[PDB]
């Protein structure tokens, strides 16, 4: 089993703020970033997709959503969404494949201030 795990399947964060949602995968000996497949999706949208060495992305999400790639080699795919609209509420789908593959879903609610 190659298992993707998440710290929180539910994030609650107020509007105008920032949030970093996380998907942790096990890192094998001698990890080659070029083999690492990662994508973040909401329903019908591609938030970010990192394949074949670097990053289909939805209309709304640049200036906004970025993968933190300096944490990749250590086995964390971290999607960081800055200024958080109420557009960003929903179910986020995390997926990582290095060799084997697995996925996790995460819920994000966003409350007005």
């Amino acid at each position: 089993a190659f298992t993707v795990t998440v710290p929180k399947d539910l994030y609650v964060v107020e509007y105008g703020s920032n949030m970093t949602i996380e998907c942790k995968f096990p890192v094998e000996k001698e990890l080659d970033l070029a083999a690492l497949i990662v994508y973040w999706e909401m329903e019908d949208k591609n938030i970010i997709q990192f394949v074949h060495g670097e990053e289909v992305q939805h209309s709304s999400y640049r200036q906004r959503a970025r993968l933190l790639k300096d944490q990749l080699s250590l086995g964390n795919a971290a999607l960081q969404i800055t200024d958080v609209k109420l557009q960003d509420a929903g179910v986020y789908r995390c997926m990582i494949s290095y060799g084997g593959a697995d996925y996790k879903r995460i819920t994000v609610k966003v409350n007005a201030p």
């Epitope: 001698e30 994508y39 949208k45 289909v56 494949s97 060799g99 084997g100 593959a101």
Partner: antibody, heavy 118, light 108 residues
């Protein structure tokens, strides 16, 4: 149990089009990982394109990149391989396949033959 | 991209024989190799995944071994059901590539 049923093959011209269809049954299409694999006559298996049906996420082999378009309709439980600007070299049996998450592809369709010729 | 080369291409064995097919990965793929069976006019059948493990429903006479570069698929006692073409495949690097063919025919 879990089945993949393919449609839309046939004979067309170079520069012509086609849409292959993949009918998914017996599993959650929401969480799956779907690929198109092709086999030219006498030749071996070549991977072509994949889609994550949840979001629109797709990625292609450099072979067919920019020509083929892979998509999915979640409400129809179907993935589509849209083949544009075909060449004779694109002639093969086309399979759609489900990713077996631990590794490899567990479920395949029966295949649909696409022949491209003048 | 990674070549997967298989060998031998053709093999003639008998029912009950031990059969060994090997696959050589162009670069280290770790354990990300899988093995398939194919009979003419039929889609590939998944046999082995993660280079070692057996897929559900695949007879225990099918085994697989390796990591890194070299991989072996082994049939302990060759059944009449088992004459086909066998493919190794690596899913680690894009594109997923297939070693192309090992045909097990029946000795006579």
């Amino acid at each position: 149990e879990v089945q993949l049923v393919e449609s839309g093959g046939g004979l067309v011209q170079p520069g012509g089009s086609l849409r292959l269809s993949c009918a998914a049954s017996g599993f959650t299409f929401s969480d799956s990982w779907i690929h198109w694999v092709r086999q030219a006559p006498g030749k071996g298996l070549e991977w072509v394109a994949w889609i994550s049906p949840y979001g629109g996420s797709t990625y292609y082999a450099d072979s067919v990149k920019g020509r083929f378009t892979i998509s999915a309709d979640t409400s129809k439980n179907t993935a589509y391989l849209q083949m544009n600007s075909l060449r004779a070299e694109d002639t093969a049996v086309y399979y759609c396949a489900r990713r077996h998450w631990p590794g490899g592809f567990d479920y395949w369709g029966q295949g649909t033959l696409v022949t491209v010729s003048s | 991209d990674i070549q997967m080369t298989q060998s031998p291409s053709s093999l003639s064995a008998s029912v009950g024989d031990r059969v060994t097919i090997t696959c050589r990965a162009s670069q280290d793929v770790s354990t990300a190799v899988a093995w398939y069976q194919q009979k003419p006019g039929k889609a590939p059948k998944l046999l082995i995944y993660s280079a070692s493990f057996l897929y559900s429903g695949v007879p225990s006479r099918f085994s697989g071994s390796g990591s890194g570069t070299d991989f072996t698929l082994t049939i302990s006692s060759l059944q009449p059901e088992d004459f086909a073409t066998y493919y190794c495949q690596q899913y680690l690097y894009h594109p997923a590539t297939f070693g192309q063919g090992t045909k097990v025919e029946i000795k006579r």
